[model samples]
Target: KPNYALKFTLAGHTKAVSSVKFSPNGEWLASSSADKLIKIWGAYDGKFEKTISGHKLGISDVAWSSDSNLLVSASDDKTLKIWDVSSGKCLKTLKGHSNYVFCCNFNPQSNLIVSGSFDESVRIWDVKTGKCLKTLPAHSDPVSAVHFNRDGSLIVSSSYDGLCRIWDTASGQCLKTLPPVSFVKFSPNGKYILAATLDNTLKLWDYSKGKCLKTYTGHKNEKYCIFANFSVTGGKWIVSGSEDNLVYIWNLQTKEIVQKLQGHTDVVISTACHPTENIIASAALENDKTIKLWKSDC
Candidate 1:
């Protein structure tokens, strides 16, 4: 295991940071918090870039476009706002969900956005026009998270209803369903789905066959809707935050605990890996109210 050292302790959010994501270009780190602000930070360094504000209530998630010039944020205010990253301006507000928007992601092409909400629906939105493309009556319970596949032709949505479903992006039809997980992400290769299960383990599923290919444990996630993501630097590692207040990194193939990052004092809710570097960011709950950046000391 490489020496994953804590490099920065970002302390700007007055409330819990609900989400954090690295831009596809590996230049910016965007974090959304219950403080109702999204803060952009320089990726390689921990320098603060800018603060984006407008959400009337707490923000739940933030995602960057493929080009890294745009960002979309989901809020407890029940609306999603797209921002122009360079100018720190809110370009458009997408309104359709009647409840809090829980999570969001930009498609690989950067033209479309997918969001899951407390209204128990998953919605597709047109980036250029801010129009809702379609709404799938996604689940019986609140939708916890959503993501688009590598080619943007399919979508996966996870819910508190205890099911994860794949949908056809073109027709908005449910293609398959798997049980378990509260958060989900499509593997970059488009061959599998990485999910954060409420059962205290992160399971990698061959979504094509509805089979669990790997189970990475040693992380506590039976409480909150935590997140697990692939390390894009080489796609050889699985990174996730734990309710136990630490970040866990696992060897994707061996399913072995490669590293346990320690420093956070509260539940580490979400983590974002740099697209091209060995840097990663972890966001913590309200008691901590911070984002910590870690870098490989190789």
Candidate 2:
């Protein structure tokens, strides 16, 4: 077992901090906020690096390109914007969704982007041209989350409609659906999916076989899209934000809460585990308006 403690707090966003993601290279941390800005910071030290501003309204999510040089953001303005992380400039603005864009992710190859929106659509875009390649009428209700598999050949999206749909990235076909899942993320091995259900539980599914392998409970998540991810270093732990204003860490094998980090005064909206390190970043809502960095002592 590992011990985790708060390392530092970043208080820059004026509004709610919606999402935080660590670059694949594990060098930078990018956070999106309702303040309509994305701030880059040092992943290892919690030092602010730069700010990216452009969206007309608030930002809901931010994702890093596999190469770590480019970043993409979903905004309430109904568009996805890509930024050159190094120069802190917008490289392209992908506009197609008619309603607010809720979630977005870049493929492993960094040439494609998949997004889910309040318009109830899942769209695939070409990174270079910003053209909408395929639009799947994803769900009946607002789409809550979307992600690509490790190989970039598949996409999984979840919605307020209470279903999670898996899609073939190229042919644009709905392959399967986990028929409350508000958020769905692919396991590091690409053989399973970790889904956040409306019942305040995280279910691990062998998506290929359509079976629930395990359920991790003990976190408050009746509402809001609280993000969750597998601990990237060893893939042995699960991390998530909660409406209870605390961060929870669960043992992957036992499905038991191993640690509770208390600091935030409001809903902890999203969390990001370092891609290759023992650090985690969590962002909270309006009341907290802060991002806390936690480090593990093995």
Candidate 3:
């Protein structure tokens, strides 16, 4: 049988879509676009449920809280907004970043928000109080991504400066710095860190030793970017999207490419794996402007 395809062409964005994510419970889909709008949809049926509009400029990213009750968005307009997902209301407008807020993430266990900006700083905020907790400045260039570990004890951030930094969540102290990192993520057990570089290489680091144990290289294209997270069944895998318009899946234990899925006609910008399913969703630019979902049996 041919693979089942579920196309969710999210409408309402007047421009290009920048980010798309599924809620933790896998019930809702949230997306942000260059059109300065964010929309939520029913995940299984692809029905539009709500639209959020307030960003003055293009939105670069959107993140949903672990409980699926709050939505956070970062924009080029130099501000981040928190929205109450159920009521479709803007709860808090976080302001402080001097430049574009590129990425943001909420710690599920602590209810804290971490944001990275082009201003070369990462700020931690208290979700309930709307107060800035700490400011970390180290990246020479824009901080592109920030994420907490599965246990929410540590935070990892990556930047265009080609470095990834690990921080202790409680002390706000920088623990280790890995260079040439475009993306970074902690493994399921929080014992390992994965750093992807613009040079098309993926490095796996042992958090305890503060050293890279393995380096995986296969992509030949110059603009290849990698994004990875733990699979639902508890294994490490890295998925890479490239300017060559291909997505490659790699097994962390074996440091090998398990599969290469192709369909995008242009640069594959971003991708996300389902929280509890064997599905992968990828978004591209210019061609179809539709998100493609893929399934794997492993």
Candidate 4:
């Protein structure tokens, strides 16, 4: 099948656009750049809406809350800021990460926030109260990604020390440790966990048994594997982006490659799926200094 693509050159950043995301409602898109600004735009027409500024360093990641009314951005400045989307105001500045906070996610069902920091820890916070709920100390190196399960009962995190961990969200205890893992994500049903690794492999684990059931591998280089997500429209598909400049879609059932997307000249740092569409968006480090969107037709 032929792949369809769209080039939305969001060109306001004096530096490269490091991260981009589609709002929960799919109406607006937000992007962060090394230029020290975040821009919100109309998703459909690419119309620029507003710019969010104040970070002392580059913004690393951006996330939308369940309601789409709020946005959370992580930065190298060692803090995370929550913003009122419509008003473009920084509602709260969460400060605790000793080093850069590379990635973060809002709990899908509640006002809780989770962040992974280069300081080698995961911090959980109560969004409304700005209170630190818990600090997970396990990884000896930086934690690159953190996410919550669909039901918000379990939290999964990935680290630079080559380990993936599952945590109990309520008590803040480490549930299980899957070593040599780079990213961990729970399936929609929460029965299974998918992990991407620096070893150029993706492994599936049975959360209940704490055993790796299968492993998938194909990439030739040791591309930094960052994140992976299951297809929301259908549970059978999985997509992941890497520093290899490729995005691979896999069949969850067969654990086989379904499609391979290749385009960006530089490393693709992150990837996200549209909540209701077949479209997938990816961001990369480019000399042209812009973000690219890729659409899958499977």
Candidate 5:
């Protein structure tokens, strides 16, 4: 429940920044906002570079292609946009969802994009064609988050219905269903699935055996669609943003809150840990419309 200091404050978005992510190469940072804008910035010194805009409503999430050349975004406007980060041009517009497209990501190889929506369906899109290739009716409520395993053979979708399901990418068949999950992801090594819940905690599951390996606490989040990601540096740490206006980092194996970073004055909705740099970028709700970069002495 304690706090940490800020390294620098990155300001550009005029509204709540919904998501912040580091490019695959760690050379750039991209932030998507409720302002309906996605901005790219220099990861080294936090300088503004360019803005990509097309969404008519708030952008909810963002993902970068493995090549670091493209970005995919999900929005409340019920569509997904693919962007060429280098040229700052929207390369494609994908439309299908009847409600908010809350979650999205690129497959590890960047060949396909997957999105989960309030429509309660998960769609897989062909990156080159911009056409939805398959739809998995895997959830009974609004899908809050979705992810692809490292090899792209499996997909996970989380919903407000308090369930998280595993699906086979080829057959679009559900493999398993677990407890209520809001934000979820597959481990970097693809050996486990990580989940965040309305229950005010995070858990790591050994999905193969359907066992909860560990639970990390000391973070507060409820219904705002918060996020957590594993560290690429070592895959031994898990970093997450919470409604408590704080950034929390936990030891992946010990399930201990080893660091609690605080500075943002509003609900912290999203954050990303740099792949090679000892830093993290976190974004907050509009009340504190700014992204804070933290240099980790951890």
Candidate 6:
């Protein structure tokens, strides 16, 4: 197995970073943390751009508008915030959920945002109006993650209740519930979901068929809501963090572990891969307090 070479060690967040994502245009990278701070950096050089701190509690997730000029954040304070990317300004605070808001994502048009919360439901918000357009009550337990399909028609969310639900956005109807997992990411091609479960395994689901196509194991991740995502490597690579203080990359077609990235010293429960580069970032729990960048082909 290859030990992905360390490229950059971003040290800023005072606590565990729960989410990290690159803008659609690949110009900037954002990392959200338990420190209640969202920091933006230059994606190429790792230059710290600015920090946006308006959420009263730890932020759990962050998503960029399709144009990459705006950002949406979900927090444990039971609220979501919209930000002006260029000015480091919180444009709006969206409130409605009665429990911690953990996951959020922008629609294909960037006109809408979907958020999942501990309140046992998913809420759809209008980006321009900052209004809660629909609250589709869902999950028996807290929802852990949420994502929108490429065409803006479907939404999927993972929950502590041990099920992944795919919803029809127009009708606000749930289409299907698959196996239990706490994290989900729509494949770049929008045909599959890479999910991490407390079962200590990563399962690739072909969402259309409602079937698990492959299972990747060999790393520990059962402690937290560890995340997984597809890489641009032919959309055939899966990368994720671990409770074992490592990052694991898997080959989709071979269904085998391709690499184990070791550097983090604490539980690494969050990771993000660049949309168009060989770069990847992984974050560890509070004790580590730094995000490590790894490059596969650099």
- Give the best candidate by lDDT: 2
Tens-digit lDDT track of model 2 for 1-298: 6688999999899999999999989998999999999999999999999999999999999999989999999999999999999998898999999999999999999999999999999999999998899999889999999999999999999988899999999999999978256899999989999999888889999998999999999999998999998995854899999999999999988998989889999999999999888898999999999999999964
Tens-place lDDT per residue, model 4, 204-269, is 889889898877776532545456777756446777776667777777778788777777666666
Per-model RMSD to reference = 1.2, 1.1, 2.7, 2.3, 2.0, 1.5
Candidate topping TM-score: 2
User: How much is 164 displaced in model 2, in angstroms?
Assistant: 0.6
For candidate 5, write residues 1-298 as lDDT tens digits. Answer: 1123577899889999999989989999999999999999888789999999889999999999999999999999999999998888888899898999999999998989999999999999999989898988878999989899999999999998889899998788999986457899999889899899988889999999999999989888775888898875643688899888999988887887878887899999998888787778999998998998877544
Worst 10 residues of 5 by lDDT: 1-10
Ranking of models by lDDT: 2, 1, 5, 6, 4, 3
Model 6 ranges off by over 4 Å? 1-3
- Writing each residue's lDDT as its tens digit, candidate 1 over 1-298 gives 6568999999899999999998888888999999999999988888999999999999999999999999999999999999999999889999999999999999999999999999999999999999899999989999989999989999999998898999999999999988446899899789999888788988899987889999998888887888788885754899999999999999999999989999999999999888888888999998899999999943
Alpha-carbon lDDT, every model:
0.91, 0.93, 0.76, 0.77, 0.88, 0.87
TM-score head-to-head 2 vs 6, winner: 2
Q: On a 0 to 100 scale, what is the lDDT of residue 76 in model 3?
A: 96
lDDT of model 6 at residue 268?
Answer: 85
Ten residues in a row with the worst lDDT in model 1? 226-235
lDDT of 1 at 66: 91
Q: 1-298 in candidate 6: lDDT tens per residue? A: 3346888889999988898888999888999999999999888788899999889999989999999999999998999999999998888889999999989999989999999999989999999888899999889898988999889999999998898989998888999988357798788788898888887898889988989999999988776888788886434578888888988888877878888888888988788888787888888888898888777663
The residue pairs in collision within model 6 are 162-180
Candidate 2 matches the true fold with a TM-score of 0.98
Candidate 3 on 247-272: residue-level lDDT in tens? 66677778787676677666666677
